[PDB]
PDB file of all heavy atoms in Angstrom:
ATOM      1  N   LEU H  33      64.329-135.808  44.299  1.00 21.44           N
ATOM      2  CA  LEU H  33      65.515-136.524  43.797  1.00 21.44           C
ATOM      3  C   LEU H  33      66.730-135.598  43.501  1.00 21.44           C
ATOM      4  O   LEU H  33      67.831-135.900  43.864  1.00 21.44           O
ATOM      5  CB  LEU H  33      65.222-137.350  42.607  1.00 21.44           C
ATOM      6  CG  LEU H  33      63.933-138.197  42.730  1.00 21.44           C
ATOM      7  CD1 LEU H  33      63.529-138.799  41.398  1.00 21.44           C
ATOM      8  CD2 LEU H  33      64.238-139.347  43.729  1.00 21.44           C
ATOM      9  N   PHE H  34      66.458-134.508  42.795  1.00 19.14           N
ATOM     10  CA  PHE H  34      67.588-133.592  42.437  1.00 19.14           C
ATOM     11  C   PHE H  34      67.125-132.155  42.088  1.00 19.14           C
ATOM     12  O   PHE H  34      65.885-131.965  41.716  1.00 19.14           O
ATOM     13  CB  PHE H  34      68.409-134.167  41.249  1.00 19.14           C
ATOM     14  CG  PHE H  34      67.530-134.324  40.026  1.00 19.14           C
ATOM     15  CD1 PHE H  34      67.377-133.242  39.097  1.00 19.14           C
ATOM     16  CD2 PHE H  34      66.842-135.484  39.751  1.00 19.14           C
ATOM     17  CE1 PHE H  34      66.574-133.308  38.011  1.00 19.14           C
ATOM     18  CE2 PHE H  34      66.080-135.636  38.609  1.00 19.14           C
ATOM     19  CZ  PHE H  34      65.898-134.597  37.726  1.00 19.14           C
ATOM     20  N   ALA H  35      67.944-131.209  42.181  1.00 17.15           N
ATOM     21  CA  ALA H  35      67.608-129.853  41.843  1.00 17.15           C
ATOM     22  C   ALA H  35      68.671-129.198  41.004  1.00 17.15           C
ATOM     23  O   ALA H  35      69.860-129.488  41.102  1.00 17.15           O
ATOM     24  CB  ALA H  35      67.462-129.008  43.203  1.00 17.15           C
ATOM     25  N   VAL H  36      68.240-128.420  40.006  1.00 14.41           N
ATOM     26  CA  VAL H  36      69.149-127.640  39.151  1.00 14.41           C
ATOM     27  C   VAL H  36      68.872-126.150  39.287  1.00 14.41           C
ATOM     28  O   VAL H  36      67.751-125.708  39.375  1.00 14.41           O
ATOM     29  CB  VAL H  36      68.950-128.077  37.652  1.00 14.41           C
ATOM     30  CG1 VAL H  36      70.146-127.567  36.882  1.00 14.41           C
ATOM     31  CG2 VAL H  36      68.807-129.536  37.521  1.00 14.41           C
ATOM     32  N   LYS H  37      69.982-125.428  39.481  1.00 15.15           N
ATOM     33  CA  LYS H  37      69.958-123.970  39.539  1.00 15.15           C
ATOM     34  C   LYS H  37      70.485-123.355  38.255  1.00 15.15           C
ATOM     35  O   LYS H  37      71.778-123.355  38.155  1.00 15.15           O
ATOM     36  CB  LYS H  37      70.723-123.421  40.769  1.00 15.15           C
ATOM     37  CG  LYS H  37      70.700-124.431  41.960  1.00 15.15           C
ATOM     38  CD  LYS H  37      71.944-124.286  42.802  1.00 15.15           C
ATOM     39  CE  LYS H  37      73.153-124.979  42.177  1.00 15.15           C
ATOM     40  NZ  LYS H  37      73.166-124.894  40.642  1.00 15.15           N
ATOM     41  N   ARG H  38      69.649-123.009  37.285  1.00 13.44           N
ATOM     42  CA  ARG H  38      70.083-122.209  36.177  1.00 13.44           C
ATOM     43  C   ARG H  38      69.727-120.731  36.433  1.00 13.44           C
ATOM     44  O   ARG H  38      68.995-120.436  37.432  1.00 13.44           O
ATOM     45  CB  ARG H  38      69.367-122.691  34.914  1.00 13.44           C
ATOM     46  CG  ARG H  38      69.640-124.176  34.550  1.00 13.44           C
ATOM     47  CD  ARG H  38      70.802-124.190  33.492  1.00 13.44           C
ATOM     48  NE  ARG H  38      71.759-125.273  33.808  1.00 13.44           N
ATOM     49  CZ  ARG H  38      72.817-125.612  33.029  1.00 13.44           C
ATOM     50  NH1 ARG H  38      72.921-125.016  31.903  1.00 13.44           N
ATOM     51  NH2 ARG H  38      73.512-126.667  33.422  1.00 13.44           N
ATOM     52  N   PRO H  39      70.154-119.824  35.472  1.00 13.28           N
ATOM     53  CA  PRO H  39      69.892-118.428  35.584  1.00 13.28           C
ATOM     54  C   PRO H  39      68.424-118.191  35.255  1.00 13.28           C
ATOM     55  O   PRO H  39      68.011-118.348  34.085  1.00 13.28           O
ATOM     56  CB  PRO H  39      70.779-117.906  34.495  1.00 13.28           C
ATOM     57  CG  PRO H  39      70.819-118.966  33.472  1.00 13.28           C
ATOM     58  CD  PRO H  39      70.677-120.207  34.130  1.00 13.28           C
ATOM     59  N   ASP H  40      67.646-117.794  36.239  1.00 14.82           N
ATOM     60  CA  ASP H  40      66.235-117.390  35.969  1.00 14.82           C
ATOM     61  C   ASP H  40      65.285-118.621  36.057  1.00 14.82           C
ATOM     62  O   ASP H  40      64.174-118.451  35.782  1.00 14.82           O
ATOM     63  CB  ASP H  40      66.127-116.619  34.699  1.00 14.82           C
ATOM     64  CG  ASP H  40      66.681-115.219  34.697  1.00 14.82           C
ATOM     65  OD1 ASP H  40      65.948-114.344  35.335  1.00 14.82           O
ATOM     66  OD2 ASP H  40      67.737-115.002  34.226  1.00 14.82           O
ATOM     67  N   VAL H  41      65.871-119.717  36.340  1.00 15.63           N
ATOM     68  CA  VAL H  41      65.061-120.931  36.710  1.00 15.63           C
ATOM     69  C   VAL H  41      65.688-121.875  37.647  1.00 15.63           C
ATOM     70  O   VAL H  41      66.943-122.164  37.562  1.00 15.63           O
ATOM     71  CB  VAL H  41      64.561-121.662  35.520  1.00 15.63           C
ATOM     72  CG1 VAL H  41      65.705-122.212  34.643  1.00 15.63           C
ATOM     73  CG2 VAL H  41      63.648-122.899  35.908  1.00 15.63           C
ATOM     74  N   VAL H  42      65.009-122.346  38.672  1.00 16.35           N
ATOM     75  CA  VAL H  42      65.373-123.468  39.488  1.00 16.35           C
ATOM     76  C   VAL H  42      64.435-124.645  39.223  1.00 16.35           C
ATOM     77  O   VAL H  42      63.144-124.470  39.180  1.00 16.35           O
ATOM     78  CB  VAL H  42      65.399-123.120  40.979  1.00 16.35           C
ATOM     79  CG1 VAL H  42      65.867-124.353  41.775  1.00 16.35           C
ATOM     80  CG2 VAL H  42      66.272-121.952  41.203  1.00 16.35           C
ATOM     81  N   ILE H  43      65.039-125.852  39.052  1.00 16.32           N
ATOM     82  CA  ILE H  43      64.284-127.079  38.673  1.00 16.32           C
ATOM     83  C   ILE H  43      64.383-128.082  39.808  1.00 16.32           C
ATOM     84  O   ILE H  43      65.434-128.450  40.274  1.00 16.32           O
ATOM     85  CB  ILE H  43      64.866-127.695  37.383  1.00 16.32           C
ATOM     86  CG1 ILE H  43      64.668-126.769  36.212  1.00 16.32           C
ATOM     87  CG2 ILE H  43      64.214-129.097  37.130  1.00 16.32           C
ATOM     88  CD1 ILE H  43      65.510-127.176  34.968  1.00 16.32           C
ATOM     89  N   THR H  44      63.245-128.605  40.256  1.00 17.61           N
ATOM     90  CA  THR H  44      63.187-129.651  41.279  1.00 17.61           C
ATOM     91  C   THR H  44      62.322-130.822  40.896  1.00 17.61           C
ATOM     92  O   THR H  44      61.162-130.732  40.559  1.00 17.61           O
ATOM     93  CB  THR H  44      62.644-129.127  42.577  1.00 17.61           C
ATOM     94  OG1 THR H  44      63.006-127.750  42.864  1.00 17.61           O
ATOM     95  CG2 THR H  44      63.124-130.005  43.741  1.00 17.61           C
ATOM     96  N   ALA H  45      62.949-132.030  40.922  1.00 21.97           N
ATOM     97  CA  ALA H  45      62.319-133.229  40.543  1.00 21.97           C
ATOM     98  C   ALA H  45      62.070-134.153  41.783  1.00 21.97           C
ATOM     99  O   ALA H  45      62.927-134.233  42.593  1.00 21.97           O
ATOM    100  CB  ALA H  45      63.136-134.037  39.419  1.00 21.97           C
ATOM    101  N   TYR H  46      60.941-134.887  41.789  1.00 21.24           N
ATOM    102  CA  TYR H  46      60.419-135.488  42.976  1.00 21.24           C
ATOM    103  C   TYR H  46      60.201-136.998  42.650  1.00 21.24           C
ATOM    104  O   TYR H  46      60.030-137.371  41.453  1.00 21.24           O
ATOM    105  CB  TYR H  46      59.022-134.842  43.320  1.00 21.24           C
ATOM    106  CG  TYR H  46      59.204-133.431  43.943  1.00 21.24           C
ATOM    107  CD1 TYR H  46      59.040-132.295  43.163  1.00 21.24           C
ATOM    108  CD2 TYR H  46      59.642-133.296  45.325  1.00 21.24           C
ATOM    109  CE1 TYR H  46      59.143-131.059  43.766  1.00 21.24           C
ATOM    110  CE2 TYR H  46      59.753-132.103  45.871  1.00 21.24           C
ATOM    111  CZ  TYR H  46      59.480-130.952  45.125  1.00 21.24           C
ATOM    112  OH  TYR H  46      59.610-129.705  45.763  1.00 21.24           O
ATOM    113  N   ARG H  47      60.146-137.807  43.676  1.00 22.68           N
ATOM    114  CA  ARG H  47      60.058-139.239  43.520  1.00 22.68           C
ATOM    115  C   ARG H  47      58.835-139.674  42.758  1.00 22.68           C
ATOM    116  O   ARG H  47      58.696-140.648  42.074  1.00 22.68           O
ATOM    117  CB  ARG H  47      60.071-139.940  44.916  1.00 22.68           C
ATOM    118  CG  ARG H  47      61.344-140.663  45.263  1.00 22.68           C
ATOM    119  CD  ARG H  47      61.186-142.147  45.192  1.00 22.68           C
ATOM    120  NE  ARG H  47      62.465-142.791  45.129  1.00 22.68           N
ATOM    121  CZ  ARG H  47      63.571-142.375  45.803  1.00 22.68           C
ATOM    122  NH1 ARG H  47      63.416-141.360  46.639  1.00 22.68           N
ATOM    123  NH2 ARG H  47      64.688-143.041  45.748  1.00 22.68           N
ATOM    124  N   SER H  48      57.741-138.825  42.971  1.00 23.39           N
ATOM    125  CA  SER H  48      56.465-139.226  42.409  1.00 23.39           C
ATOM    126  C   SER H  48      56.333-138.908  40.900  1.00 23.39           C
ATOM    127  O   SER H  48      55.421-139.202  40.237  1.00 23.39           O
ATOM    128  CB  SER H  48      55.325-138.435  43.070  1.00 23.39           C
ATOM    129  OG  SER H  48      55.347-137.080  42.552  1.00 23.39           O
ATOM    130  N   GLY H  49      57.389-138.226  40.391  1.00 21.96           N
ATOM    131  CA  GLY H  49      57.381-137.753  39.033  1.00 21.96           C
ATOM    132  C   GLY H  49      56.982-136.325  38.832  1.00 21.96           C
ATOM    133  O   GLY H  49      57.038-135.790  37.720  1.00 21.96           O
ATOM    134  N   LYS H  50      56.560-135.633  39.878  1.00 24.59           N
ATOM    135  CA  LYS H  50      56.306-134.217  39.807  1.00 24.59           C
ATOM    136  C   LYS H  50      57.654-133.456  39.580  1.00 24.59           C
ATOM    137  O   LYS H  50      58.606-133.682  40.195  1.00 24.59           O
ATOM    138  CB  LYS H  50      55.673-133.625  41.054  1.00 24.59           C
ATOM    139  CG  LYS H  50      54.912-132.380  40.895  1.00 24.59           C
ATOM    140  CD  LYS H  50      53.853-132.196  42.005  1.00 24.59           C
ATOM    141  CE  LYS H  50      54.546-132.156  43.332  1.00 24.59           C
ATOM    142  NZ  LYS H  50      53.498-132.189  44.401  1.00 24.59           N
ATOM    143  N   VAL H  51      57.597-132.499  38.608  1.00 25.74           N
ATOM    144  CA  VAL H  51      58.719-131.661  38.295  1.00 25.74           C
ATOM    145  C   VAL H  51      58.390-130.181  38.327  1.00 25.74           C
ATOM    146  O   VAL H  51      57.417-129.747  37.614  1.00 25.74           O
ATOM    147  CB  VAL H  51      59.449-132.015  36.990  1.00 25.74           C
ATOM    148  CG1 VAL H  51      60.618-131.124  36.723  1.00 25.74           C
ATOM    149  CG2 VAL H  51      59.805-133.499  36.896  1.00 25.74           C
ATOM    150  N   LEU H  52      59.080-129.426  39.121  1.00 23.99           N
ATOM    151  CA  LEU H  52      58.690-128.050  39.419  1.00 23.99           C
ATOM    152  C   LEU H  52      59.732-127.089  38.711  1.00 23.99           C
ATOM    153  O   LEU H  52      60.933-127.325  38.892  1.00 23.99           O
ATOM    154  CB  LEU H  52      58.690-127.746  40.892  1.00 23.99           C
ATOM    155  CG  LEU H  52      57.884-126.730  41.643  1.00 23.99           C
ATOM    156  CD1 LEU H  52      58.377-125.255  41.404  1.00 23.99           C
ATOM    157  CD2 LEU H  52      56.420-126.829  41.198  1.00 23.99           C
ATOM    158  N   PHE H  53      59.276-126.169  37.950  1.00 22.63           N
ATOM    159  CA  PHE H  53      60.100-125.088  37.401  1.00 22.63           C
ATOM    160  C   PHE H  53      59.910-123.759  38.096  1.00 22.63           C
ATOM    161  O   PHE H  53      58.768-123.204  38.144  1.00 22.63           O
ATOM    162  CB  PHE H  53      59.978-124.970  35.921  1.00 22.63           C
ATOM    163  CG  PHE H  53      60.357-126.246  35.136  1.00 22.63           C
ATOM    164  CD1 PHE H  53      59.506-127.295  34.943  1.00 22.63           C
ATOM    165  CD2 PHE H  53      61.672-126.348  34.590  1.00 22.63           C
ATOM    166  CE1 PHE H  53      59.858-128.418  34.312  1.00 22.63           C
ATOM    167  CE2 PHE H  53      62.025-127.459  33.873  1.00 22.63           C
ATOM    168  CZ  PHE H  53      61.112-128.551  33.743  1.00 22.63           C
ATOM    169  N   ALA H  54      60.943-123.146  38.591  1.00 26.40           N
ATOM    170  CA  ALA H  54      60.805-121.918  39.338  1.00 26.40           C
ATOM    171  C   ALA H  54      61.691-120.767  38.801  1.00 26.40           C
ATOM    172  O   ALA H  54      62.823-120.940  38.604  1.00 26.40           O
ATOM    173  CB  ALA H  54      61.043-122.065  40.853  1.00 26.40           C
TER     174      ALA H  54
END
Side-chain angles (χ1 to χ4, degrees):
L33 309 169
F34 63 84
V36 196
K37 331 150 280 37
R38 300 264 137 175
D40 287 284
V41 59
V42 183
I43 297 167
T44 325
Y46 285 101
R47 253 258 164 32
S48 78
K50 202 158 61 187
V51 180
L52 208 285
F53 298 84

